[PDB]
Scaffold this active site. Structure first.
Site, PDB file in Angstrom:
ATOM      1  N   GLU A   1       4.183   2.703   3.174  1.00  0.00           N
ATOM      2  CA  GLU A   1       4.635   4.050   3.522  1.00  0.00           C
ATOM      3  C   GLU A   1       4.355   4.492   4.952  1.00  0.00           C
ATOM      4  O   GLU A   1       4.085   5.666   5.180  1.00  0.00           O
ATOM      5  CB  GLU A   1       4.029   5.061   2.536  1.00  0.00           C
ATOM      6  CG  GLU A   1       4.179   4.597   1.087  1.00  0.00           C
ATOM      7  CD  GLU A   1       3.690   5.607   0.065  1.00  0.00           C
ATOM      8  OE1 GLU A   1       4.390   6.622  -0.156  1.00  0.00           O
ATOM      9  OE2 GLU A   1       2.605   5.377  -0.517  1.00  0.00           O
TER      10      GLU A   1
ATOM     11  N   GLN B   1       2.490  -2.877   1.147  1.00  0.00           N
ATOM     12  CA  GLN B   1       1.350  -2.930   0.232  1.00  0.00           C
ATOM     13  C   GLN B   1       0.657  -4.279   0.313  1.00  0.00           C
ATOM     14  O   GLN B   1       1.262  -5.278   0.711  1.00  0.00           O
ATOM     15  CB  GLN B   1       1.797  -2.685  -1.213  1.00  0.00           C
ATOM     16  CG  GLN B   1       2.172  -1.223  -1.528  1.00  0.00           C
ATOM     17  CD  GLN B   1       3.467  -0.791  -0.854  1.00  0.00           C
ATOM     18  OE1 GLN B   1       4.387  -1.590  -0.665  1.00  0.00           O
ATOM     19  NE2 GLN B   1       3.553   0.483  -0.517  1.00  0.00           N
TER      20      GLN B   1
ATOM     21  N   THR C   1      12.504   3.545   7.116  1.00  0.00           N
ATOM     22  CA  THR C   1      13.163   4.720   7.653  1.00  0.00           C
ATOM     23  C   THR C   1      13.690   4.336   9.029  1.00  0.00           C
ATOM     24  O   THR C   1      14.778   4.744   9.425  1.00  0.00           O
ATOM     25  CB  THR C   1      12.183   5.910   7.759  1.00  0.00           C
ATOM     26  OG1 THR C   1      11.695   6.232   6.447  1.00  0.00           O
ATOM     27  CG2 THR C   1      12.895   7.141   8.344  1.00  0.00           C
TER      28      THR C   1
HETATM   29  N1  LIG Z   1       8.331  13.901   7.785  1.00  0.00           N
HETATM   30  C1  LIG Z   1       8.426  12.585   7.854  1.00  0.00           C
HETATM   31  N2  LIG Z   1       8.634  11.704   6.964  1.00  0.00           N
HETATM   32  C2  LIG Z   1       8.684  10.405   7.313  1.00  0.00           C
HETATM   33  C3  LIG Z   1       8.527   9.832   8.634  1.00  0.00           C
HETATM   34  N3  LIG Z   1       8.659   8.520   8.443  1.00  0.00           N
HETATM   35  C4  LIG Z   1       8.895   7.991   7.168  1.00  0.00           C
HETATM   36  N4  LIG Z   1       8.886   9.340   6.517  1.00  0.00           N
HETATM   37  C5  LIG Z   1       9.087   9.434   5.065  1.00  0.00           C
HETATM   38  O1  LIG Z   1       7.930   8.726   4.416  1.00  0.00           O
HETATM   39  C6  LIG Z   1       8.325   7.913   3.213  1.00  0.00           C
HETATM   40  C7  LIG Z   1       7.986   6.511   3.509  1.00  0.00           C
HETATM   41  O2  LIG Z   1       8.779   5.937   4.581  1.00  0.00           O
HETATM   42  P1  LIG Z   1       9.411   4.512   4.445  1.00  0.00           P
HETATM   43  O3  LIG Z   1      10.311   4.212   5.583  1.00  0.00           O
HETATM   44  O4  LIG Z   1       9.905   4.153   3.064  1.00  0.00           O
HETATM   45  O5  LIG Z   1       8.040   3.698   4.662  1.00  0.00           O
HETATM   46  P2  LIG Z   1       7.751   2.178   4.681  1.00  0.00           P
HETATM   47  O6  LIG Z   1       6.902   2.292   3.409  1.00  0.00           O
HETATM   48  O7  LIG Z   1       6.836   1.816   5.785  1.00  0.00           O
HETATM   49  O8  LIG Z   1       8.974   1.488   4.502  1.00  0.00           O
HETATM   50  C8  LIG Z   1       9.873   8.199   3.137  1.00  0.00           C
HETATM   51  O9  LIG Z   1      10.033   9.307   2.153  1.00  0.00           O
HETATM   52  C9  LIG Z   1      10.338   8.694   4.533  1.00  0.00           C
HETATM   53  O10 LIG Z   1      11.494   9.537   4.630  1.00  0.00           O
HETATM   54  C10 LIG Z   1       8.301  10.852   9.576  1.00  0.00           C
HETATM   55  O11 LIG Z   1       8.134  10.442  10.851  1.00  0.00           O
HETATM   56  N5  LIG Z   1       8.239  12.173   9.285  1.00  0.00           N
HETATM   57  F1  ALF Z   2       8.109   0.893   0.996  1.00  0.00           F
HETATM   58 AL1  ALF Z   2       6.878   0.283   2.114  1.00  0.00          AL
HETATM   59  F2  ALF Z   2       5.681  -0.330   3.245  1.00  0.00           F
HETATM   60  F3  ALF Z   2       5.618   1.346   1.442  1.00  0.00           F
HETATM   61  F4  ALF Z   2       8.134  -0.768   2.777  1.00  0.00           F
END
Ligand SMILES: Nc1nc2c(ncn2[C@@H]2O[C@H](COP(=O)(O)OP(=O)(O)O)[C@@H](O)[C@H]2O)c(=O)[nH]1
Ligand code: ALF
Ligand SMILES: [Mg+2]
Lengths: 317, 38, 133
Positions: A12, A173, A17
Protein backbone atom coordinates in the site's frame (compact mmCIF):
# COMPACT_ATOMS: atom_id res chain seq x y z
CA UNK A 1 16.85 2.20 -26.23
CA UNK A 2 14.63 0.14 -23.93
CA UNK A 3 14.26 1.02 -20.24
CA UNK A 4 13.45 -1.59 -17.58
CA UNK A 5 11.90 0.28 -14.67
CA UNK A 6 10.90 -1.33 -11.36
CA UNK A 7 8.27 0.03 -8.99
CA UNK A 8 9.22 -1.28 -5.53
CA UNK A 9 7.93 -0.58 -2.04
CA UNK A 10 6.09 -2.02 0.96
CA UNK A 11 2.41 -2.86 0.75
CA UNK A 12 0.00 0.00 0.00
CA UNK A 13 2.79 2.50 -0.75
CA UNK A 14 1.22 3.70 -4.02
CA UNK A 15 2.84 1.56 -6.73
CA UNK A 16 -0.22 0.49 -8.71
CA UNK A 17 -1.62 3.98 -8.47
CA UNK A 18 1.50 5.21 -10.23
CA UNK A 19 0.83 2.58 -12.93
CA UNK A 20 -2.71 3.88 -13.40
CA UNK A 21 -1.30 7.38 -13.92
CA UNK A 22 1.02 6.05 -16.62
CA UNK A 23 -2.09 4.67 -18.33
CA UNK A 24 -3.83 8.04 -18.09
CA UNK A 25 -0.74 10.06 -19.02
CA UNK A 26 1.31 7.97 -21.45
CA UNK A 27 -1.24 5.47 -22.71
CA UNK A 28 -4.87 5.22 -23.78
CA UNK A 29 -6.36 6.46 -20.51
CA UNK A 30 -9.71 5.15 -19.25
CA UNK A 31 -12.75 4.61 -21.46
CA UNK A 32 -16.35 4.61 -20.24
CA UNK A 33 -16.59 0.83 -20.20
CA UNK A 34 -13.24 0.73 -18.39
CA UNK A 35 -14.43 3.10 -15.68
CA UNK A 36 -17.65 1.15 -15.25
CA UNK A 37 -15.50 -1.85 -14.29
CA UNK A 38 -14.38 -0.03 -11.15
CA UNK A 39 -17.88 0.24 -9.70
CA UNK A 40 -17.74 -3.18 -8.00
CA UNK A 41 -14.27 -2.41 -6.70
CA UNK A 42 -15.40 0.91 -5.25
CA UNK A 43 -18.56 -0.53 -3.68
CA UNK A 44 -16.38 -3.30 -2.28
CA UNK A 45 -13.88 -0.79 -0.89
CA UNK A 46 -16.69 1.27 0.60
CA UNK A 47 -18.30 -1.64 2.45
CA UNK A 48 -15.00 -3.02 3.74
CA UNK A 49 -14.11 0.45 5.03
CA UNK A 50 -17.28 1.06 7.05
CA UNK A 51 -17.18 -2.50 8.40
CA UNK A 52 -13.64 -1.98 9.70
CA UNK A 53 -14.67 1.22 11.47
CA UNK A 54 -17.73 -0.48 12.94
CA UNK A 55 -15.56 -3.33 14.19
CA UNK A 56 -13.06 -0.89 15.71
CA UNK A 57 -15.91 0.65 17.71
CA UNK A 58 -15.84 -2.44 19.92
CA UNK A 59 -12.04 -2.88 19.66
CA UNK A 60 -11.29 0.67 20.87
CA UNK A 61 -14.37 0.76 23.06
CA UNK A 62 -15.89 3.87 21.47
CA UNK A 63 -19.60 4.52 21.97
CA UNK A 64 -21.96 5.54 19.19
CA UNK A 65 -23.34 9.06 19.36
CA UNK A 66 -26.85 7.58 19.08
CA UNK A 67 -27.78 4.12 20.42
CA UNK A 68 -30.08 3.55 17.43
CA UNK A 69 -26.88 3.07 15.42
CA UNK A 70 -26.06 -0.08 17.38
CA UNK A 71 -28.98 -1.72 15.61
CA UNK A 72 -27.92 -0.29 12.23
CA UNK A 73 -24.44 -1.72 12.75
CA UNK A 74 -25.81 -5.20 13.54
CA UNK A 75 -27.92 -5.13 10.40
CA UNK A 76 -25.03 -3.94 8.25
CA UNK A 77 -22.88 -6.87 9.38
CA UNK A 78 -25.71 -9.29 8.56
CA UNK A 79 -26.31 -7.84 5.08
CA UNK A 80 -22.56 -7.86 4.46
CA UNK A 81 -22.78 -11.66 4.41
CA UNK A 82 -25.88 -12.01 2.23
CA UNK A 83 -25.51 -9.32 -0.45
CA UNK A 84 -23.64 -10.12 -3.65
CA UNK A 85 -20.04 -8.95 -3.34
CA UNK A 86 -19.47 -5.61 -5.05
CA UNK A 87 -23.07 -4.39 -4.87
CA UNK A 88 -24.51 -1.51 -2.86
CA UNK A 89 -28.29 -1.99 -2.28
CA UNK A 90 -30.44 0.99 -1.29
CA UNK A 91 -30.98 -0.47 2.18
CA UNK A 92 -27.26 -0.93 2.72
CA UNK A 93 -26.23 2.57 1.57
CA UNK A 94 -28.93 4.17 3.72
CA UNK A 95 -27.50 2.38 6.75
CA UNK A 96 -23.94 3.29 5.85
CA UNK A 97 -24.90 6.95 5.40
CA UNK A 98 -26.47 7.08 8.86
CA UNK A 99 -23.47 5.44 10.50
CA UNK A 100 -21.06 7.81 8.77
CA UNK A 101 -22.88 10.80 10.26
CA UNK A 102 -22.62 9.40 13.80
CA UNK A 103 -20.20 11.28 16.08
CA UNK A 104 -18.93 8.03 17.56
CA UNK A 105 -18.14 6.56 14.15
CA UNK A 106 -16.36 9.82 13.24
CA UNK A 107 -14.28 9.64 16.45
CA UNK A 108 -13.40 6.07 15.54
CA UNK A 109 -12.60 7.04 11.91
CA UNK A 110 -10.17 9.69 13.21
CA UNK A 111 -8.33 7.00 15.15
CA UNK A 112 -7.83 4.87 12.03
CA UNK A 113 -4.08 4.63 12.71
CA UNK A 114 -5.05 2.31 15.57
CA UNK A 115 -6.49 -0.40 13.28
CA UNK A 116 -6.40 -1.32 9.58
CA UNK A 117 -8.38 1.03 7.33
CA UNK A 118 -8.25 1.68 3.58
CA UNK A 119 -6.58 4.97 2.61
CA UNK A 120 -9.60 6.09 0.57
CA UNK A 121 -12.18 5.22 3.24
CA UNK A 122 -12.98 8.86 3.90
CA UNK A 123 -12.94 9.77 0.22
CA UNK A 124 -15.64 7.23 -0.65
CA UNK A 125 -17.74 7.34 2.51
CA UNK A 126 -17.97 11.15 2.61
CA UNK A 127 -19.53 11.09 -0.88
CA UNK A 128 -21.52 7.85 -0.76
CA UNK A 129 -24.67 9.53 -2.11
CA UNK A 130 -22.92 10.42 -5.38
CA UNK A 131 -21.61 6.87 -5.73
CA UNK A 132 -25.07 5.31 -5.40
CA UNK A 133 -26.87 7.74 -7.72
CA UNK A 134 -28.53 6.10 -10.76
CA UNK A 135 -26.23 6.38 -13.77
CA UNK A 136 -23.08 6.70 -11.66
CA UNK A 137 -19.86 6.53 -13.69
CA UNK A 138 -16.51 6.43 -11.84
CA UNK A 139 -14.44 9.56 -12.48
CA UNK A 140 -10.68 9.29 -12.98
CA UNK A 141 -10.10 10.28 -9.35
CA UNK A 142 -12.58 7.61 -8.20
CA UNK A 143 -10.55 5.07 -10.18
CA UNK A 144 -7.15 6.29 -8.93
CA UNK A 145 -8.45 6.14 -5.35
CA UNK A 146 -9.69 2.55 -5.72
CA UNK A 147 -7.90 -0.22 -3.85
CA UNK A 148 -7.00 -3.66 -5.17
CA UNK A 149 -4.22 -5.66 -3.53
CA UNK A 150 -1.68 -6.69 -6.18
CA UNK A 151 -0.22 -10.19 -6.21
CA UNK A 152 2.60 -11.17 -8.55
CA UNK A 153 4.65 -9.18 -11.06
CA UNK A 154 2.90 -7.18 -13.78
CA UNK A 155 4.46 -5.50 -16.81
CA UNK A 156 3.16 -2.48 -18.72
CA UNK A 157 4.84 -0.75 -21.66
CA UNK A 158 4.78 2.75 -23.10
CA UNK A 159 7.06 5.13 -25.00
CA UNK A 160 8.23 8.52 -23.78
CA UNK A 161 11.11 10.85 -24.74
CA UNK A 162 11.93 8.26 -27.44
CA UNK A 163 12.40 5.62 -24.74
CA UNK A 164 10.59 2.29 -24.61
CA UNK A 165 9.52 1.68 -21.02
CA UNK A 166 9.00 -1.79 -19.62
CA UNK A 167 7.57 -0.93 -16.22
CA UNK A 168 7.18 -3.68 -13.64
CA UNK A 169 4.63 -3.45 -10.86
CA UNK A 170 5.12 -5.82 -7.91
CA UNK A 171 3.14 -6.65 -4.78
CA UNK A 172 4.55 -5.18 -1.57
CA UNK A 173 3.49 -7.52 1.26
CA UNK A 174 6.13 -9.77 2.81
CA UNK A 175 4.90 -12.86 0.96
CA UNK A 176 5.17 -11.05 -2.38
CA UNK A 177 8.80 -10.05 -1.89
CA UNK A 178 9.93 -13.65 -2.48
CA UNK A 179 9.07 -12.94 -6.12
CA UNK A 180 10.96 -9.64 -6.52
CA UNK A 181 14.22 -11.38 -7.39
CA UNK A 182 12.65 -12.49 -10.70
CA UNK A 183 12.90 -9.03 -12.21
CA UNK A 184 16.26 -7.84 -10.85
CA UNK A 185 18.21 -8.47 -14.09
CA UNK A 186 19.20 -5.53 -16.29
CA UNK A 187 17.32 -2.93 -14.27
CA UNK A 188 17.68 0.59 -15.67
CA UNK A 189 15.96 2.40 -12.81
CA UNK A 190 14.07 1.76 -9.62
CA UNK A 191 11.37 3.98 -8.18
CA UNK A 192 10.99 3.18 -4.50
CA UNK A 193 7.67 4.29 -3.07
CA UNK A 194 7.34 5.20 0.58
CA UNK A 195 4.00 6.23 2.07
CA UNK A 196 4.78 9.33 4.17
CA UNK A 197 1.57 8.80 6.14
CA UNK A 198 2.77 5.35 7.28
CA UNK A 199 4.74 6.78 10.18
CA UNK A 200 2.03 5.95 12.71
CA UNK A 201 0.61 2.78 11.19
CA UNK A 202 1.45 -0.90 11.68
CA UNK A 203 1.72 -3.64 9.03
CA UNK A 204 -1.33 -5.64 8.00
CA UNK A 205 0.96 -8.73 8.05
CA UNK A 206 2.45 -7.96 11.48
CA UNK A 207 0.41 -5.73 13.80
CA UNK A 208 3.51 -5.20 15.96
CA UNK A 209 5.69 -3.70 13.22
CA UNK A 210 5.54 0.03 12.40
CA UNK A 211 5.03 0.47 8.63
CA UNK A 212 7.69 3.11 8.14
CA UNK A 213 10.29 1.01 9.95
CA UNK A 214 9.53 -1.77 7.44
CA UNK A 215 9.95 0.60 4.48
CA UNK A 216 13.26 1.81 5.88
CA UNK A 217 14.61 -1.75 6.13
CA UNK A 218 13.48 -2.40 2.56
CA UNK A 219 15.07 0.77 1.19
CA UNK A 220 18.23 0.09 3.17
CA UNK A 221 18.51 -3.35 1.58
CA UNK A 222 17.62 -2.10 -1.92
CA UNK A 223 19.77 1.02 -2.19
CA UNK A 224 22.92 -0.66 -0.85
CA UNK A 225 22.53 -3.84 -2.92
CA UNK A 226 25.42 -4.73 -5.24
CA UNK A 227 23.00 -5.58 -8.06
CA UNK A 228 21.90 -1.96 -8.38
CA UNK A 229 25.22 -0.12 -8.48
CA UNK A 230 24.57 1.01 -12.07
CA UNK A 231 20.84 1.47 -11.49
CA UNK A 232 19.28 4.89 -11.08
CA UNK A 233 17.32 4.82 -7.82
CA UNK A 234 14.59 7.36 -7.18
CA UNK A 235 12.75 7.69 -3.87
CA UNK A 236 9.08 8.69 -4.06
CA UNK A 237 7.88 9.96 -0.67
CA UNK A 238 4.23 9.32 -1.54
CA UNK A 239 0.89 10.39 -0.04
CA UNK A 240 2.09 13.90 0.85
CA UNK A 241 -1.54 15.02 0.84
CA UNK A 242 -2.47 12.51 3.54
CA UNK A 243 0.75 13.21 5.41
CA UNK A 244 0.02 16.95 5.34
CA UNK A 245 -3.25 16.27 7.21
CA UNK A 246 -1.99 13.60 9.56
CA UNK A 247 1.05 15.55 10.81
CA UNK A 248 -1.32 18.09 12.33
CA UNK A 249 -2.67 15.58 14.85
CA UNK A 250 -0.21 12.68 15.10
CA UNK A 251 3.42 13.29 16.32
CA UNK A 252 6.28 11.95 14.23
CA UNK A 253 7.85 10.80 17.50
CA UNK A 254 5.54 7.76 17.15
CA UNK A 255 8.02 6.58 14.55
CA UNK A 256 11.24 8.39 15.46
CA UNK A 257 11.34 8.77 19.29
CA UNK A 258 14.24 11.24 19.02
CA UNK A 259 12.67 13.67 16.56
CA UNK A 260 12.84 17.11 18.18
CA UNK A 261 11.60 19.23 15.28
CA UNK A 262 8.10 20.65 14.89
CA UNK A 263 5.31 18.41 13.66
CA UNK A 264 4.84 20.36 10.44
CA UNK A 265 4.76 19.24 6.82
CA UNK A 266 8.09 20.80 5.83
CA UNK A 267 10.17 19.95 8.86
CA UNK A 268 8.73 16.47 9.53
CA UNK A 269 8.65 15.69 5.83
CA UNK A 270 12.30 16.66 5.41
CA UNK A 271 13.27 14.68 8.50
CA UNK A 272 11.71 11.54 7.05
CA UNK A 273 13.43 12.18 3.70
CA UNK A 274 16.78 12.50 5.49
CA UNK A 275 16.29 9.29 7.50
CA UNK A 276 15.79 7.41 4.23
CA UNK A 277 18.51 9.10 2.21
CA UNK A 278 21.14 8.54 4.89
CA UNK A 279 20.65 4.76 4.64
CA UNK A 280 22.72 5.04 1.44
CA UNK A 281 26.18 4.28 2.77
CA UNK A 282 27.57 5.10 -0.66
CA UNK A 283 26.01 8.57 -0.74
CA UNK A 284 29.48 9.83 -1.66
CA UNK A 285 29.63 7.94 -4.94
CA UNK A 286 26.04 7.78 -6.20
CA UNK A 287 23.23 10.08 -5.13
CA UNK A 288 19.63 9.01 -4.58
CA UNK A 289 17.07 11.42 -6.03
CA UNK A 290 13.83 12.00 -4.13
CA UNK A 291 10.42 13.63 -4.68
CA UNK A 292 7.44 14.32 -2.43
CA UNK A 293 4.48 12.92 -4.34
CA UNK A 294 0.74 12.45 -4.45
CA UNK A 295 0.19 9.43 -6.69
CA UNK A 296 -3.51 10.21 -7.07
CA UNK A 297 -2.68 13.67 -8.48
CA UNK A 298 -2.23 13.37 -12.25
CA UNK A 299 -0.38 16.67 -12.68
CA UNK A 300 2.04 15.91 -9.84
CA UNK A 301 2.80 12.45 -11.21
CA UNK A 302 3.20 13.79 -14.75
CA UNK A 303 5.75 16.32 -13.49
CA UNK A 304 7.70 13.89 -11.33
CA UNK A 305 7.79 11.18 -13.99
CA UNK A 306 9.20 13.76 -16.38
CA UNK A 307 12.05 14.50 -13.96
CA UNK A 308 12.67 10.75 -13.54
CA UNK A 309 13.00 10.29 -17.29
CA UNK A 310 15.48 13.18 -17.38
CA UNK A 311 17.60 11.42 -14.76
CA UNK A 312 17.52 8.17 -16.74
CA UNK A 313 18.45 10.12 -19.86
CA UNK A 314 21.22 12.04 -18.09
CA UNK A 315 22.49 8.85 -16.45
CA UNK A 316 22.67 6.95 -19.75
CA UNK A 317 25.14 9.65 -20.83
CA UNK B 1 15.81 -24.35 -7.45
CA UNK B 2 15.52 -21.03 -5.62
CA UNK B 3 14.80 -22.97 -2.42
CA UNK B 4 17.71 -25.40 -2.81
CA UNK B 5 20.43 -22.80 -2.09
CA UNK B 6 22.68 -23.67 0.91
CA UNK B 7 23.70 -21.39 3.77
CA UNK B 8 20.29 -20.43 5.14
CA UNK B 9 20.96 -21.68 8.67
CA UNK B 10 21.73 -18.92 11.15
CA UNK B 11 20.23 -15.93 9.34
CA UNK B 12 17.44 -13.92 10.94
CA UNK B 13 13.92 -12.96 9.93
CA UNK B 14 15.25 -9.67 8.49
CA UNK B 15 16.53 -11.79 5.61
CA UNK B 16 14.18 -14.78 5.47
CA UNK B 17 11.05 -12.64 5.75
CA UNK B 18 11.59 -8.93 5.20
CA UNK B 19 14.23 -8.83 2.43
CA UNK B 20 14.19 -12.37 0.87
CA UNK B 21 16.55 -11.56 -2.01
CA UNK B 22 19.32 -10.98 0.54
CA UNK B 23 19.70 -14.77 0.92
CA UNK B 24 21.36 -14.62 -2.53
CA UNK B 25 23.55 -11.54 -1.93
CA UNK B 26 26.72 -13.56 -2.46
CA UNK B 27 25.65 -14.27 -6.05
CA UNK B 28 26.16 -12.18 -9.20
CA UNK B 29 23.12 -11.52 -11.40
CA UNK B 30 24.41 -13.89 -14.09
CA UNK B 31 24.80 -16.62 -11.46
CA UNK B 32 21.15 -16.28 -10.38
CA UNK B 33 20.14 -17.78 -13.72
CA UNK B 34 22.92 -20.40 -13.64
CA UNK B 35 21.81 -21.70 -10.27
CA UNK B 36 18.13 -21.74 -11.19
CA UNK B 37 17.08 -19.01 -8.77
CA UNK B 38 15.50 -16.98 -11.58
CA UNK C 1 -11.19 -31.56 -23.66
CA UNK C 2 -11.50 -28.65 -26.08
CA UNK C 3 -13.99 -26.01 -24.82
CA UNK C 4 -16.69 -24.73 -27.15
CA UNK C 5 -16.82 -21.01 -27.93
CA UNK C 6 -19.88 -20.45 -25.73
CA UNK C 7 -18.18 -22.16 -22.79
CA UNK C 8 -15.03 -20.03 -23.00
CA UNK C 9 -16.99 -16.78 -23.40
CA UNK C 10 -18.88 -17.80 -20.28
CA UNK C 11 -15.58 -17.68 -18.33
CA UNK C 12 -15.83 -13.90 -18.78
CA UNK C 13 -19.33 -13.70 -17.26
CA UNK C 14 -17.79 -13.78 -13.79
CA UNK C 15 -14.88 -15.26 -11.87
CA UNK C 16 -17.06 -18.02 -10.42
CA UNK C 17 -17.64 -19.56 -13.86
CA UNK C 18 -13.94 -19.57 -14.78
CA UNK C 19 -12.63 -21.10 -11.55
CA UNK C 20 -15.48 -23.64 -11.32
CA UNK C 21 -14.37 -25.02 -14.69
CA UNK C 22 -11.50 -27.58 -14.99
CA UNK C 23 -10.23 -26.19 -18.29
CA UNK C 24 -10.81 -22.66 -17.01
CA UNK C 25 -8.54 -23.18 -14.00
CA UNK C 26 -5.92 -24.74 -16.26
CA UNK C 27 -6.00 -21.73 -18.60
CA UNK C 28 -6.03 -19.30 -15.67
CA UNK C 29 -2.99 -21.06 -14.20
CA UNK C 30 -0.88 -20.55 -17.35
CA UNK C 31 -1.66 -16.87 -16.91
CA UNK C 32 -0.93 -16.73 -13.17
CA UNK C 33 2.42 -18.40 -13.78
CA UNK C 34 3.18 -15.60 -16.22
CA UNK C 35 2.48 -13.09 -13.41
CA UNK C 36 4.27 -15.17 -10.74
CA UNK C 37 1.11 -15.55 -8.65
CA UNK C 38 0.40 -19.23 -9.18
CA UNK C 39 0.40 -19.97 -5.44
CA UNK C 40 -3.09 -18.47 -5.13
CA UNK C 41 -4.70 -21.04 -7.39
CA UNK C 42 -2.59 -23.76 -5.84
CA UNK C 43 -3.81 -22.75 -2.39
CA UNK C 44 -7.45 -22.60 -3.45
CA UNK C 45 -7.39 -26.14 -4.84
CA UNK C 46 -5.52 -27.44 -1.81
CA UNK C 47 -8.36 -26.05 0.30
CA UNK C 48 -11.06 -27.60 -1.88
CA UNK C 49 -9.21 -30.92 -1.67
CA UNK C 50 -8.97 -30.72 2.11
CA UNK C 51 -12.71 -30.04 2.43
CA UNK C 52 -14.13 -32.60 0.00
CA UNK C 53 -11.32 -35.16 -0.09
CA UNK C 54 -10.81 -38.16 2.18
CA UNK C 55 -11.80 -36.78 5.58
CA UNK C 56 -9.34 -39.12 7.32
CA UNK C 57 -6.36 -37.33 5.77
CA UNK C 58 -7.38 -33.92 7.13
CA UNK C 59 -4.53 -33.80 9.65
CA UNK C 60 -1.84 -34.71 7.12
CA UNK C 61 -3.24 -32.41 4.45
CA UNK C 62 -3.49 -29.49 6.87
CA UNK C 63 0.10 -29.92 8.02
CA UNK C 64 1.28 -30.07 4.42
CA UNK C 65 -0.72 -27.00 3.41
CA UNK C 66 0.73 -25.07 6.37
CA UNK C 67 4.27 -26.05 5.44
CA UNK C 68 3.78 -25.12 1.78
CA UNK C 69 1.55 -22.02 1.88
CA UNK C 70 1.34 -20.57 5.42
CA UNK C 71 4.65 -20.95 7.27
CA UNK C 72 6.80 -17.81 7.35
CA UNK C 73 8.90 -17.96 4.19
CA UNK C 74 6.98 -20.88 2.72
CA UNK C 75 7.84 -21.90 -0.87
CA UNK C 76 4.34 -20.86 -1.97
CA UNK C 77 3.71 -18.36 0.82
CA UNK C 78 0.32 -16.74 0.23
CA UNK C 79 -0.72 -13.10 0.63
CA UNK C 80 -3.16 -12.92 3.58
CA UNK C 81 -3.36 -10.43 6.45
CA UNK C 82 -2.05 -10.98 9.97
CA UNK C 83 -5.49 -11.55 11.52
CA UNK C 84 -6.68 -14.07 8.93
CA UNK C 85 -3.36 -15.90 9.30
CA UNK C 86 -3.57 -15.87 13.09
CA UNK C 87 -7.09 -17.29 12.90
CA UNK C 88 -5.91 -20.00 10.50
CA UNK C 89 -2.76 -20.95 12.43
CA UNK C 90 -4.76 -21.29 15.64
CA UNK C 91 -7.41 -23.40 13.96
CA UNK C 92 -4.75 -25.64 12.44
CA UNK C 93 -3.75 -26.61 15.98
CA UNK C 94 -6.88 -28.77 15.86
CA UNK C 95 -7.57 -29.39 12.10
CA UNK C 96 -10.97 -29.88 10.45
CA UNK C 97 -12.91 -29.79 7.17
CA UNK C 98 -13.47 -26.02 7.03
CA UNK C 99 -10.42 -24.87 9.00
CA UNK C 100 -9.05 -22.94 5.99
CA UNK C 101 -12.30 -21.19 5.04
CA UNK C 102 -11.16 -17.71 6.14
CA UNK C 103 -7.87 -17.92 4.25
CA UNK C 104 -9.53 -19.46 1.20
CA UNK C 105 -12.09 -16.66 0.92
CA UNK C 106 -9.38 -14.01 1.19
CA UNK C 107 -7.30 -15.66 -1.53
CA UNK C 108 -10.40 -16.15 -3.66
CA UNK C 109 -11.18 -12.43 -3.58
CA UNK C 110 -7.51 -11.64 -4.19
CA UNK C 111 -7.61 -13.45 -7.59
CA UNK C 112 -11.10 -12.18 -8.49
CA UNK C 113 -10.32 -8.50 -7.97
CA UNK C 114 -6.74 -8.45 -9.30
CA UNK C 115 -5.70 -11.39 -11.50
CA UNK C 116 -9.08 -12.28 -13.10
CA UNK C 117 -9.63 -8.86 -14.67
CA UNK C 118 -6.21 -8.96 -16.36
CA UNK C 119 -6.76 -12.58 -17.41
CA UNK C 120 -9.77 -11.65 -19.53
CA UNK C 121 -7.69 -9.02 -21.35
CA UNK C 122 -4.64 -11.26 -21.82
CA UNK C 123 -3.37 -12.94 -25.03
CA UNK C 124 -3.80 -16.28 -23.27
CA UNK C 125 -7.56 -15.84 -22.93
CA UNK C 126 -7.99 -14.31 -26.39
CA UNK C 127 -6.25 -17.38 -27.77
CA UNK C 128 -8.56 -19.69 -25.84
CA UNK C 129 -11.43 -17.90 -27.58
CA UNK C 130 -9.69 -18.32 -30.93
CA UNK C 131 -8.99 -22.07 -30.77
CA UNK C 132 -12.50 -22.42 -29.34
CA UNK C 133 -14.36 -25.00 -31.41
N1 LIG D 1 -4.74 10.28 -0.84
C1 LIG D 1 -3.96 9.39 -1.43
N2 LIG D 1 -4.12 8.16 -1.69
C2 LIG D 1 -3.14 7.48 -2.31
C3 LIG D 1 -1.86 7.97 -2.77
N3 LIG D 1 -1.27 6.91 -3.31
C4 LIG D 1 -1.90 5.67 -3.35
N4 LIG D 1 -3.13 6.18 -2.66
C5 LIG D 1 -4.23 5.25 -2.38
O1 LIG D 1 -3.71 4.21 -1.44
C6 LIG D 1 -4.20 2.82 -1.74
C7 LIG D 1 -3.02 2.00 -2.05
O2 LIG D 1 -2.34 2.39 -3.27
P1 LIG D 1 -1.88 1.32 -4.31
O3 LIG D 1 -1.36 1.97 -5.55
O4 LIG D 1 -2.80 0.14 -4.49
O5 LIG D 1 -0.62 0.79 -3.47
P2 LIG D 1 0.43 -0.30 -3.78
O6 LIG D 1 -0.08 -1.17 -2.62
O7 LIG D 1 1.80 0.14 -3.42
O8 LIG D 1 0.16 -0.83 -5.06
C8 LIG D 1 -5.14 3.09 -2.98
O9 LIG D 1 -6.52 3.21 -2.43
C9 LIG D 1 -4.73 4.44 -3.61
O10 LIG D 1 -5.70 5.20 -4.35
C10 LIG D 1 -1.74 9.34 -2.46
O11 LIG D 1 -0.58 9.92 -2.83
N5 LIG D 1 -2.68 10.08 -1.83
F1 ALF E 1 -1.40 -3.76 -3.51
AL1 ALF E 1 0.27 -3.51 -2.97
F2 ALF E 1 1.93 -3.25 -2.47
F3 ALF E 1 -0.22 -3.31 -1.27
F4 ALF E 1 0.75 -3.71 -4.66
MG1 LIG F 1 -0.29 -2.68 -6.25
Amino acid sequence: RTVKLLLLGAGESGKSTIVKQMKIIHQDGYSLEECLEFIAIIYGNTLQSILAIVRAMTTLNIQYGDSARQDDARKLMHMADTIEEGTMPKEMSDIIQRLWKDSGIQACFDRASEYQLNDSAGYYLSDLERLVTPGYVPTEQDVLRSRVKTTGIIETQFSFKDLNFRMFDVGGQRSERKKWIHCFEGVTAIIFCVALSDYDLVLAEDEEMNRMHESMKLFDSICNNKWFTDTSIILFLNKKDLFEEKIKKSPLTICYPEYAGSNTYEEAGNYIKVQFLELNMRRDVKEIYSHMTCATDTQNVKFVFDAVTDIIIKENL
Amino acid sequence: FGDDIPGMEGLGTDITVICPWEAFNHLELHELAQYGII
Amino acid sequence: DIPTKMRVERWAFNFSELIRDPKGRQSFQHFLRKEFSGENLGFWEACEDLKYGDQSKVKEKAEEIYKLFLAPGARRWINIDGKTMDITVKGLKHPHRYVLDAAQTHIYMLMKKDSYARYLKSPIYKEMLAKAI
